[PDB]
Amino acid sequence: PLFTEGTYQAEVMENSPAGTPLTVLNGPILALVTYQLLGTHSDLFVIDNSTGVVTVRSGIIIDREAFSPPFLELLLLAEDIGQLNGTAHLFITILDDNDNWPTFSPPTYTVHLLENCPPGFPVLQVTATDEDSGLNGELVYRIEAGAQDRFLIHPVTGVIRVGNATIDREEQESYRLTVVATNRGTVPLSGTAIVTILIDDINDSRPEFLNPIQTVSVLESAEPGTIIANVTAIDLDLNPKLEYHIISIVAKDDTDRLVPDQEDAFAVNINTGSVMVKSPLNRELVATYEVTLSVIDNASDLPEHSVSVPNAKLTVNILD
């Protein structure tokens, strides 16, 4: 006997159900008659002992992901009507199905990121996996939601970086992104992951006064100790520690003439910004004060941002 080829190339999609004809690229399988088919992975198939058409067996599940290499070598026999034996070979590529989902494991990320970091700073890398080959196995990364144009992901490498935005903790303290990884090809399977981005703090904000301009009339009969006004500030960083100081006291008499040496006339509480009369008052002596107070967050990592602008103006008018 003589098979029409020495070696027949052949294909089969993984998961093909029982009875599926094997696809023969240089077939049909013919000998010029009985037939059988031998080999180690012969038991995934049955051959017809007359036609020599070959098919998947019953109760057999052909997984490409379980054969590496994903190719099969078998032997074909042909019995002569009186006992001679011709033979040929059968190569069989097992073709790939997209039967494996992009998997994130862990399926969830949480990472910290210091603020004021520059454009294109790399934040982290997500990696999904996929047990298929070619188109079916490859992965387009995408952020489906949560980024707010402050974050971007490399479609190929999964690496997430900052966009063309300043990332200020005091603007927004965290992000929760939803990232997709998708297969290419005719069956676009995807998997999703959560990325949670926590902005760590730099003490980079200015304390600012909430009540900056102030004009208060007080009686000359006010004694040292009397509380007159209260300046108040906030600093939007974590763990600020503010101090209030006075640095101007500009004193004018009844008709606009200045009066030397009155840094003592009032005092502010370093911790509360409560301001009190300190040395005694008299309209006839001084009828107006121009007190200027600043405040300084003492924990500030940037001196440039560590002090109120504007300062607070308290003008005090004395009555009879």
Q: How far is the CB of 181 from Ca ion (least distance, A)?
A: 10
Handedness of CA 227, 233, 234, 238 (dihedral sign): negative
Closer residue to Ca ion in complex, CB, 286/296: 296
Query: Which of residues 83 and 239 has its CB atom nearest to Ca ion in the complex?
Result: 239
Q: How far apart are CA 108 and CA 126, in angstroms?
A: 9
> Residue 9, exposed/middle/buried by CB under 10 A (0-12, 13-18, 19+)?
middle
Q: Which is nearer to Ca ion, 52 or 191 (CB)?
A: 191
CB of 189 or CB of 228, closer to Ca ion = 189
Least spacing, CB of residue 62 vs Ca ion, in Å: 9
Q: How far is the CB of 220 from Ca ion (least distance, A)?
A: 39
User: What residues make contact with Ca ion under the rule CB under 5 A?
Assistant: 63-65, 96-100, 130, 132, 136, 168-170, 183, 201-205, 235, 237, 240, 297, 300
Closer Cβ to Ca ion, 63 or 73, answer by number: 63
Q: CA angle at residue 170 from 166 to 172, to 5 degrees?
A: 70
CB closer to Ca ion out of 63 and 263: 63
Closest distance of CB 2 from Ca ion, Å: 37
- Smallest gap from Cβ 174 to Ca ion, in A, equals 13
Question: Of the two residues 57 and 89, which places its CB atom closer to Ca ion in the complex?
Answer: 57
Please, what is the minimum distance in Å from the beta carbon of residue 199 to Ca ion? 9
CB of 112 to Ca ion, least distance (A): 14
